[PDB]
Amino acid sequence: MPSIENFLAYDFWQYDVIRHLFAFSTAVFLAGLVYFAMTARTTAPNYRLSANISAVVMVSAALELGQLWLLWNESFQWAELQGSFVPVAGERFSNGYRYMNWLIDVPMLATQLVVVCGFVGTELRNRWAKLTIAGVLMILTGYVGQYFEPAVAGVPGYEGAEQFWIWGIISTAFFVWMLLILANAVRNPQGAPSDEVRSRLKFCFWFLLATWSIYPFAYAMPLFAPTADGVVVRQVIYTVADVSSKLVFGVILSQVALRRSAEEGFEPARVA
Amino acid sequence: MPSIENFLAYDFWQYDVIRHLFAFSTAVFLAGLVYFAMTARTTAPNYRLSANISAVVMVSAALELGQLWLLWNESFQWAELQGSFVPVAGERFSNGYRYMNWLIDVPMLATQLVVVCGFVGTELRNRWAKLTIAGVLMILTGYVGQYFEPAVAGVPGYEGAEQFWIWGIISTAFFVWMLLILANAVRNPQGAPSDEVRSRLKFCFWFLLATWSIYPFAYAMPLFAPTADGVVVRQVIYTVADVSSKLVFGVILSQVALRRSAEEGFEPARVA
Amino acid sequence: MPSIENFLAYDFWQYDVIRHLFAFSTAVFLAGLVYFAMTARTTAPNYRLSANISAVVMVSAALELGQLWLLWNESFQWAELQGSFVPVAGERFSNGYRYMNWLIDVPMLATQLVVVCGFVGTELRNRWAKLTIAGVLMILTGYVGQYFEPAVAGVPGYEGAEQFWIWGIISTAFFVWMLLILANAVRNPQGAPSDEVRSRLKFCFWFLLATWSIYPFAYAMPLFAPTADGVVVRQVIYTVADVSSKLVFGVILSQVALRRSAEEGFEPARVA
Amino acid sequence: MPSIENFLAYDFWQYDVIRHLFAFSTAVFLAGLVYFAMTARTTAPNYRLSANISAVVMVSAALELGQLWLLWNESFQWAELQGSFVPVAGERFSNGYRYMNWLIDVPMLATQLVVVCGFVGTELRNRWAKLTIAGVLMILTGYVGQYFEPAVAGVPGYEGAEQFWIWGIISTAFFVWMLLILANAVRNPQGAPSDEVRSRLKFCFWFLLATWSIYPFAYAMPLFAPTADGVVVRQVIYTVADVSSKLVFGVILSQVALRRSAEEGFEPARVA
Amino acid sequence: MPSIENFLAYDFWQYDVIRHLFAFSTAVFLAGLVYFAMTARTTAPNYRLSANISAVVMVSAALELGQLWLLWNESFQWAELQGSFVPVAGERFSNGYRYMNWLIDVPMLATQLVVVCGFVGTELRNRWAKLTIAGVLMILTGYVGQYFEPAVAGVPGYEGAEQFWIWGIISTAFFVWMLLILANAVRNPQGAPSDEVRSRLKFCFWFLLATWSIYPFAYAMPLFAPTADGVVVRQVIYTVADVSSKLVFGVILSQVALRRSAEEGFEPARVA
Ligand SMILES: CCCCCCCCCCCCO[C@@H]1O[C@H](CO)[C@@H](O[C@H]2O[C@H](CO)[C@@H](O)[C@H](O)[C@H]2O)[C@H](O)[C@H]1O
Ligand SMILES: CCCCCCCCCCCCO[C@@H]1O[C@H](CO)[C@@H](O[C@H]2O[C@H](CO)[C@@H](O)[C@H](O)[C@H]2O)[C@H](O)[C@H]1O
Ligand SMILES: CCCCCCCCCCCCO[C@@H]1O[C@H](CO)[C@@H](O[C@H]2O[C@H](CO)[C@@H](O)[C@H](O)[C@H]2O)[C@H](O)[C@H]1O
Ligand SMILES: CCCCCCCCCCCCO[C@@H]1O[C@H](CO)[C@@H](O[C@H]2O[C@H](CO)[C@@H](O)[C@H](O)[C@H]2O)[C@H](O)[C@H]1O
Ligand SMILES: CCCCCCCCCCCCO[C@@H]1O[C@H](CO)[C@@H](O[C@H]2O[C@H](CO)[C@@H](O)[C@H](O)[C@H]2O)[C@H](O)[C@H]1O
Ligand SMILES: CCCCCCCCCCCCO[C@@H]1O[C@H](CO)[C@@H](O[C@H]2O[C@H](CO)[C@@H](O)[C@H](O)[C@H]2O)[C@H](O)[C@H]1O
Ligand SMILES: CCCCCCCCCCCCO[C@@H]1O[C@H](CO)[C@@H](O[C@H]2O[C@H](CO)[C@@H](O)[C@H](O)[C@H]2O)[C@H](O)[C@H]1O
Ligand SMILES: CCCCCCCCCCCCO[C@@H]1O[C@H](CO)[C@@H](O[C@H]2O[C@H](CO)[C@@H](O)[C@H](O)[C@H]2O)[C@H](O)[C@H]1O
Ligand SMILES: CCCCCCCCCCCCO[C@@H]1O[C@H](CO)[C@@H](O[C@H]2O[C@H](CO)[C@@H](O)[C@H](O)[C@H]2O)[C@H](O)[C@H]1O
Ligand SMILES: CCCCCCCCCCCCO[C@@H]1O[C@H](CO)[C@@H](O[C@H]2O[C@H](CO)[C@@H](O)[C@H](O)[C@H]2O)[C@H](O)[C@H]1O
Ligand SMILES: *C/C=C(C)/C=C/C=C(C)/C=C/C1=C(C)CCCC1(C)C
Ligand SMILES: *C/C=C(C)/C=C/C=C(C)/C=C/C1=C(C)CCCC1(C)C
Ligand SMILES: *C/C=C(C)/C=C/C=C(C)/C=C/C1=C(C)CCCC1(C)C
Ligand SMILES: *C/C=C(C)/C=C/C=C(C)/C=C/C1=C(C)CCCC1(C)C
Ligand SMILES: *C/C=C(C)/C=C/C=C(C)/C=C/C1=C(C)CCCC1(C)C
């Protein structure tokens, strides 16, 4: 079913704020792509893969936000008589456009964290495979669940509110599995890290946890506040979570990777 | 004739999922282009051509999926009364937009496999020529066959279902010729490869065989499930095949090429 | 509420000038992105972050202006009978689209100034954190205030003119806090700068203060000139401020950074 | 006058094929741009200009095909009752959008061939000048002639069929002049080329002659087959000629330039 | 007032040629961007600023022509009954869209000429400042003047023909001031240039003078030939002037800069 955004009329500022959020996020991710591309070579070869993954995540996020921006603009039009933006006839907005891109983002973010933790070769491949399986199952179950949010929001005609809960809970279990893999990786770093590096890797894990925990809250938003205000708040928290989880986490992880490159004698890392 | 996608009405989730699949694949291929471009120079000069071909394939795939996404959005519109996305009056969706880009993708993928296998000069040129001839004939025959899809699906007023079978079978024969060439290349690697390299090249051949085999199934889908559910499944399998056979195959092949560069003494490959 | 631009009819030259301004600013920022990307590596590694932040700012600004240009074109249409561009029925223009991109621009600009001042590590992080907090609060308060501009302009049916003043004043206080932080950074440069560097850093502070001060005037324009002429002058001052405070400030700051790099023995900086 | 494409109704497969051709060629040329930009530095500096020109040609061709694709999509719409794509009311397709871009492509292609032939300095400038004059006159005369193709095709109400022949013949004379310059350049290479280089340069000249000769046939198609089938054949041969004469010719010329760089001692060329 | 292009009906070839010119120029400038970006590092660091300015000019020109192309397509539509492209109801074309981008182009072009003349530091800054002031005043006065071209063309209901003359004459005076500055720079080159460099710098001055002089003629076209043929010829001379004054001028200037770099011992310049 269509997302809860399609069953509401929006005041000008509500709609304006949401479209600004999508534009801004797209700008953030394109600028982050430029930044990571310009700075990747400062990281040592053995960690550069994390810098490259950051670039990849920026590309994915830029496109996902840009398509949300496009769809948001196309799905609603101003109605002067009501003083509100209202659904257009032939288009329907979907918040699910972000979920399929998370298939790229989430595994990549976890993998780059494992990379900076120092895992290589088969250990790296195995942790990447576990993180991809868990993340993909989490995203797909949440993606199924998010198609029932008009039902769970009590919009007349729509049925299947229990599917929302069921698929959300299954996705939560897979989220816990990913968090357990990442905790094991951040606690068992390879390559003889310094105490500062160990603490920074732990902080990176906790930052990832805090930022990723926002997404289930936005998923549950139709249950709590199925209003225009709730939609605005949901888009705001998506914007905070997206920017933090991808760009800010990438910047922090790059700082950790640069510290490890410096501690291993990478001259560009040391001068920078 | 118009593809079977034009003769069905879509529930919101079906149409939504297909548009998300096209957007997601476009994002995957643009991010893959960025990745390959940033990492190509880690491969030794004598294998860098494969890394370059990967970049080329990403470009081709990005545009082919983006045009699919555009056309999908333009060809259908929401209908509130029916609660379904229905075909628009002036536009018709086509699934054949992917076929012509395969003219780039398929020879390039096979070629880069032959490259990493160590064939150079005239031996390389001869394998590239054979792979291009076989692949172009395969793609063109399947392309002709895919225009009789509504006829083979039993849509009234459409004739020529036998053409679907005939051109699909001819394309299958050319596919077998491609596979035979690639098997001879993966079994006769040049440049004195290590046992690990040989096994990884064989795995690459089998991965290509497995991922390319999804395309004839997707081609056959109008026969087995000419429904909206069958269309969704078709697009999902295309997404899996596209992502695997281009991006994941490129990553695996870059790993083999990097290992061969390391074993030949390429220092960037060895440090990385 | 919709910005004051939506409540006026525009002569051809007024509308034409505004759309030319948006397009020209977009061109300026894309060209600046190309320039800074091509020139970043001339700055020494310990100051290259400023060159990178300039690239980031150019990206942000390019998209912010391009989206304003798109919206401006979409929100109004020619009406030959009146000889004027008038609001279209289904779209409303918003000047607030620039405000969310300022979230990127303003902290980045301040930070790159602090970088060229020579602050590193935790001192850098702390100043970046203060400048981001102050700038985000400033931008968000001004963004809230700018939604009441038809009310402050005396357009009938719109209430809440006092919110315009209140949020503008709060934003002014946060602006003063940012200016104080930047004055402390520019007055306490690190790394033993030369007298010429010290004076150029002070000039960069005053240039930032002068260019940033145009934004509150543009914010106040609905109060003084809620006409088509006032809209034109607003957009002209916005263009001047955008170009100066981002591109010209980046060029001047790159010159200071290059001078510091030369002083510290960076050979690319010295030859250039 | 409008091109002959505007006076026909198209079956779905005819229209579909043509749009696929334009999109495919655009993808080819963008991929080619990525490839040439990634590989230009492998050529020695005294031949790198040809690699740069290949990149330029790719850019030009990509845009020329993308605009043809756009216009083709806009100029026609599906009509379900007739089962055909028919011209829209407000738009007309033009095949002349390619001709103006040839002003870039044709001189550049000839010039890069002269470059790889070894001509430098004033001799290079003189051959570039002659090739540009001849090619520009060729393109402009053919461009004038192509505006009379509805007349030459016998579409009622259109006069001036003799202009088609006259301007085509004048363009053919200028084509012969260009071929004569290129033949003299490839028969008198500079810089003491090896026999393989000499033969490969002669091959490149004959390849250019073969691929460029398709364009007058496509120009003459309105005369022989002013039908939808003839339109499809025209676009197909344009696609073959475009791809060959730009991309494949560039690849082959890069191979010659690489061989000459290896024979003059350019290490990157020798390792690759 | 709307440009004279809005008050005429266009034959198919006239409208077709104009849209081809806009597209072709956009392609030229994007290809120029790619060329200058790929070749900038061949110039020595003390002259590489000119190469960077060429890249910047390409960006600006590409966007300006692209927007003229877009606006041209949107402002007119085919009318089968009249056999002509006629103005659409809700859009009006503006030739002034190039003027604001000239704010970037003209100072940059003059400045890069002064750079290759060898002026550095404060002397360079002073000449850049004079050139920017004169050029901005020139462009703004001509921009004001070009808003009266329907009046000067004698279209009924439009007054103010004298403003066209007045602002054109003031802009001509500022053009003369620019030319005087550039003549002083080209006649007093720094860095002890060779006689060949001195003569090539003088030729660059005369080439700039010849190509820039076309713009006042195009500005005067509404007075001489306010017809569809006059519009076509104006766009043609705009295309010639744009290509020559930006791309061709950049190529010639890069040749002078390369010769100076080689004379000063820049090895990449000498090998290339
Ligand atoms: C959407 C586009 C995504 C493209 C890239 C995806 C990367 C996913 C990483 C999966 C982790 C498991 O497999 C891992 O793969 C990476 C990338 O090939 C390999 O990485 C290797 O190549 C890259 C360059 O290609 C080097 O920077 C790295 O130092 C080197 O080890 C690891 O040796 C391997 O262990
Ligand atoms: C609109 C957005 C666009 C621009 C956004 C730019 C993002 C910039 C992010 C800057 C990074 C912040 O810097 C980060 O600060 C935290 C502060 O706790 C530091 O963390 C530090 O303190 C914590 C406290 O618990 C310790 O656990 C950790 O070991 C220590 O290093 C990180 O090591 C550092 O990387
Ligand atoms: C859509 C864009 C496609 C662009 C690239 C197409 C590649 C097609 C490969 C065909 C294989 C046969 O021809 C082969 O061509 C490649 C590319 O010129 C040549 O490759 C040569 O140039 C490339 C590029 O500088 C080097 O990375 C490589 O090391 C070198 O051998 C081979 O020596 C030749 O044997
Ligand atoms: C969705 C967006 C895209 C995200 C990014 C995707 C990146 C994908 C990276 C995949 C890496 C796979 O890595 C690949 O794993 C297989 C696992 O069998 C390894 O293969 C290994 O086992 C097989 C048997 O199973 C042997 O035949 C082979 O010789 C051996 O090396 C490959 O040597 C390795 O290259
Ligand atoms: C919208 C995308 C923006 C992304 C980039 C934002 C960077 C500015 C944030 C400043 C936060 C303060 O924290 C600061 O972070 C930067 C960036 O990691 C670090 O910078 C470090 O890495 C960069 C490359 O990544 C090097 O050029 C620099 O020399 C080095 O010090 C500083 O050591 C740290 O003190
Ligand atoms: C149309 C788009 C816009 C295009 C803009 C193109 C780039 C603009 C480049 C501007 C360069 C300005 O250059 C800047 O000039 C000022 C002039 O006061 C110099 O400043 C100099 O004088 C001031 C006093 O006036 C002193 O306080 C300062 O210490 C001294 O260096 C700066 O050291 C120099 O960096
Ligand atoms: C629209 C975007 C335009 C962005 C760039 C505009 C440049 C215009 C320069 C005009 C003159 C200003 O003054 C001049 O500025 C340039 C650019 O900082 C400085 O140039 C300095 O840095 C650049 C890189 O940033 C080097 O290539 C150059 O060798 C070096 O001298 C000159 O030392 C100074 O004399
Ligand atoms: C769908 C888009 C496709 C994208 C990718 C396309 C890549 C195209 C790569 C083409 C490579 C062809 O490679 C080219 O082969 C011919 C074969 O006659 C060789 O030519 C060779 O044989 C001919 C035979 O008459 C001799 O005249 C010539 O002297 C000799 O060198 C060229 O030396 C080589 O450069
Ligand atoms: C659609 C178009 C896209 C592609 C366009 C490509 C542009 C290529 C431009 C080629 C460069 C022209 O080359 C230029 O020729 C003139 C010819 O007078 C030379 O000039 C030479 O002769 C003149 C007199 O005529 C002397 O004053 C000068 O000192 C001398 O060098 C320039 O030194 C050279 O730089
Ligand atoms: C349309 C996009 C831009 C097109 C740019 C390319 C146009 C080339 C046309 C050839 C004109 C003949 O004149 C020729 O010009 C080229 C390009 O400046 C010069 O080439 C010189 O600069 C280039 C670029 O730095 C170097 O790769 C080359 O090694 C060097 O010789 C030749 O010395 C000169 O003889
Ligand atoms: C950049 C995108 C990111 C980091 C996305 C992260 C997404 C999640 C952590 C998703 C979590 C989910 C659950 C735990 C429950 C509800 C369903 C999901 C998929 C939203
Ligand atoms: C990235 C795109 C790829 C790898 C495409 C591959 C396509 C095939 C292997 C196509 C095969 C076909 C047949 C064997 C039978 C039916 C017709 C085709 C063309 C779909
Ligand atoms: C590139 C964008 C820049 C430099 C934006 C700067 C914005 C400001 C300095 C904002 C100032 C404000 C006030 C001081 C009062 C009115 C509200 C604001 C947000 C416009
Ligand atoms: C990439 C574009 C290319 C190689 C274009 C080439 C064009 C020609 C060789 C044009 C030839 C013409 C004639 C000889 C006669 C008919 C008119 C022309 C312009 C099509
Ligand atoms: C790339 C764009 C360029 C070089 C533009 C140049 C513009 C001029 C030389 C403008 C000249 C003018 C006058 C001298 C009189 C009439 C008004 C102007 C602005 C067109």
Question: Chain A contact for C92, CB < 8 A?
Answer: yes
Q: Do chains B and A touch (3 or more CB pairs under 8 A)?
A: yes
Residues in chain B: 272
Which of D25, D57, D102, D245 best tests ligand 14's pocket when mutated (most atoms within 8 Å of CB)? D102
Spell out the SS3 assignment of E68-112. HHHHHHHHEEEECCCCEEEECCCCCCCCCHHHHHHHHHHHHHHHH
C-alpha Rg value of chain A to the nearest Å: 20
- Measured in whole angstroms, how far is the alpha carbon of residue D28 from the centre of its chain? 13
Q: How far apart are CA C226 and CA C5, in angstroms?
A: 8
Question: Chain D contact for E268, CB < 8 A?
Answer: yes
Residue E243 Cβ inside 6 Å of ligand 9? The answer reads: yes
Instruction: Collect all residues with Cβ–Cβ distance below 8 Å to D108 and sequence separation of at least 6.
Output: D53, D56, D57, D60
DSSP state of B87: E
How far is the CA of B129 from the CAs of B136, C74, D171, D197, in angstroms?
Answer: 10, 50, 35, 22
Question: Chain C contact for E102, CB < 8 A?
Answer: no
Residue C212 Cβ inside 6 Å of ligand 13? The answer reads: yes
Instruction: Collect all residues with Cβ–Cβ distance below 8 Å to B44 and sequence separation of at least 6.
Output: B257, B260, B261, B264, B266, B269
How far is the CA of D103 from the CAs of B195, D138, D147, D236, in angstroms?
Answer: 54, 9, 17, 22
Residue E216: both structure tokens together: 């006042």
- Residue the block writes with tokens 């080619």: D32
Half-sphere exposure of C41 (CA within 13 A, CB side): 10
Q: How far apart are CA A26 and CA A238, in angstroms?
A: 13
Q: How far apart are CA C246 and CA C35, in angstroms?
A: 13
Q: How far apart are CA B11 and CA B30, in angstroms?
A: 29
Contact by Cβ (8 Å): D265, D77: no
* CA-closest candidate to residue E139, choices E113, E177, E180: E177
* CA-closest candidate to residue D228, choices D70, D64, D83: D83
The bound ligand whose nearest atom lies closest to the alpha carbon of B127 is 3
Residue E121 Cβ inside 6 Å of ligand 7? The answer reads: yes
> Which residue's CA is minimally distant from atom 31 of ligand 4?
B200
Query: What's the gap in Å between the CA of E130 and the closest CA on chain C?
Result: 16
Instruction: Collect all residues with Cβ–Cβ distance below 8 Å to A226 and sequence separation of at least 6.
Output: A4, A7, A8, A153, A154, A155
Q: Do chains E and C touch (3 or more CB pairs under 8 A)?
A: yes
Q: How far apart are CA C84 and CA B246, in angstroms?
A: 53
Contact by Cβ (8 Å): A100, A72: no
Instruction: Collect all residues with Cβ–Cβ distance below 8 Å to A21 and sequence separation of at least 6.
Output: A235, A236, A238, A239, C100
Cβ neighbour number for residue C117 with a 10 Å cutoff:
28
E55/C271 Cβ within 8 A: no
CA of B48 to the centre of ligand 3 (A): 10
Cβ neighbour number for residue E192 with a 10 Å cutoff:
9
Experimental method: cryo-EM
* CA-closest candidate to residue C232, choices C14, C13, C21: C14
CA of B255 to the centre of ligand 4 (A): 9
How far is the CA of A93 from the CAs of A71, A72, A73, B13, D94, in angstroms?
Answer: 6, 6, 9, 12, 36
Residue A7 Cβ inside 6 Å of ligand 11? The answer reads: no
- Residue the block writes with tokens 């397509």: E73
DSSP state of C191: S
Amino acid at D46: N
* CA-closest candidate to residue E7, choices E162, E220, E150, E151: E150
Beta strand residue intervals within C70-176, DSSP E: 76-79, 84-87
Question: Chain E contact for C78, CB < 8 A?
Answer: yes
Ligand 14 lining (C-beta closer than 6 Å): D 102, 105-106, 138-139, 142, 168, 171-172, 175, 212, 215-216, 219, 242, 245-246
Sequence spans of domains, chain A: 4-271
How far is the CA of B272 from the CAs of B50, B267, D176, in angstroms?
Answer: 18, 8, 54
Q: How far apart are CA B39 and CA E248, in angstroms?
A: 35
C-alpha Rg value of chain B to the nearest Å: 20
Task: Provide φ and ψ at C59, rounded to 5°.
Answer: -60, -60
Residue C223: both structure tokens together: 């109060």
Half-sphere exposure of D203 (CA within 13 A, CB side): 14
Residue C42 Cβ inside 6 Å of ligand 7? The answer reads: yes
Which of B36, B200, B207 best tests ligand 4's pocket when mutated (most atoms within 8 Å of CB)? B200
Residue B246 Cβ inside 6 Å of ligand 4? The answer reads: no
C34/E56 Cβ within 8 A: yes
Task: Provide φ and ψ at A79, rounded to 5°.
Answer: -120, 105
Residue C60 Cβ inside 6 Å of ligand 13? The answer reads: no
C78-C82-C87 Cα angle (round to 5)? 45
* CA-closest candidate to residue D33, choices D52, D57, D53, D58: D58
> Which residue's CA is minimally distant from atom 2 of ligand 7?
C32
Question: Chain A contact for C30, CB < 8 A?
Answer: no
Contact by Cβ (8 Å): A92, A74: no
Amino acid at B232: V
A-B CB pairs within 8 A amount to 76
How far is the CA of D77 from the CAs of B92, D22, D69, in angstroms?
Answer: 9, 17, 14
Q: How far apart are CA E254 and CA E245, in angstroms?
A: 13
SS3 assignment, position E10: strand
Q: Pairing relation of β-strands D84-87 and D76-79?
A: antiparallel
- Measured in whole angstroms, how far is the alpha carbon of residue B105 from the centre of its chain? 6
Amino acid at D250: G
Residue E43: both structure tokens together: 């110039």
DSSP state of C5: G
Provide the greatest CA pair distance for chain B.
Answer: 68
Per-residue DSSP letters for chain D? ---GGGG--B-HHHHHHHHHHHHHHHHHHHHHHHHHHHHGGGS-TTTHHHHHHHHHHHHHHHHHHHHHHHHHHHHEEEETTTTEEEE-SS----TTHHHHHHHHHHHHHHHHHHHHTT--HHHHHHHHHHHHHHHHHHHHHHHHHGGGHHHHTT-TT---HHHHHHHHHHHHHHHHHHHHHHHHHHHS--S---HHHHHHHHHHHHHHHHHHTHHHHHHHHHHH--SHHHHHHHHHHHHHHHIIIIIIHHHHHHHHHHHHHHHTT-HHHHH-
Consecutive H or E run containing C128: helix C121-145
Instruction: Collect all residues with Cβ–Cβ distance below 8 Å to E236 and sequence separation of at least 6.
Output: E17, E21
**CA-based nearest residue in chain A for residue C71:** A73
Spell out the SS3 assignment of chain A. CCCHHHHCCECHHHHHHHHHHHHHHHHHHHHHHHHHHHHHHHCCCCCHHHHHHHHHHHHHHHHHHHHHHHHHHHHEEEECCCCEEEECCCCCCCCCHHHHHHHHHHHHHHHHHHHHCCCCHHHHHHHHHHHHHHHHHHHHHHHHHHHHHHHHCCCCCCCCHHHHHHHHHHHHHHHHHHHHHHHHHHHCCCCCCCHHHHHHHHHHHHHHHHHHCHHHHHHHHHHHCCCHHHHHHHHHHHHHHHHHHHHHHHHHHHHHHHHHHHHCCCHHHHHC
Beta strand residue intervals within chain B, DSSP E: 76-79, 84-87
Q: How far apart are CA B227 and CA B84, in angstroms?
A: 14
Residue D51: both structure tokens together: 């690699």
Question: Chain A contact for B70, CB < 8 A?
Answer: no
Q: How far apart are CA A203 and CA A184, in angstroms?
A: 14
* Architecture of the domain made up of E4-271: Up-down Bundle (1.20)
Residue A208: both structure tokens together: 């990832």
Which of A67, A91, A95 best tests the B interface by mutation, with the highest count of B CBs <10 A? A67
The bound ligand whose nearest atom lies closest to the alpha carbon of C102 is 13
Instruction: Collect all residues with Cβ–Cβ distance below 8 Å to E268 and sequence separation of at least 6.
Output: D45, E41, E42, E261
Residue E153: both structure tokens together: 């063309």
What is the structure's resolution, reported in angstroms to one decimal? 2.1
Contact by Cβ (8 Å): E249, E43: no
**Nearest-atom index, ligand 3, CA of B47:** 29
- Residue the block writes with tokens 């860098």: B48
Instruction: Collect all residues with Cβ–Cβ distance below 8 Å to A39 and sequence separation of at least 6.
Output: A51, A254, C52
**Nearest-atom index, ligand 2, CA of C108:** 4
Instruction: Collect all residues with Cβ–Cβ distance below 8 Å to D132 and sequence separation of at least 6.
Output: D107, D111
* CA-closest candidate to residue A102, choices A72, A152, A141: A141
Q: How far apart are CA D213 and CA C224, in angstroms?
A: 68
SS3 assignment, position B138: helix
Contact by Cβ (8 Å): D222, D149: yes
Residue D240 Cβ inside 6 Å of ligand 8? The answer reads: no
Instruction: Collect all residues with Cβ–Cβ distance below 8 Å to B228 and sequence separation of at least 6.
Output: B8, B9, B10, B11, B14
Contact by Cβ (8 Å): A64, A95: no
Query: What's the gap in Å between the CA of A270 and the closest CA on chain B?
Result: 17
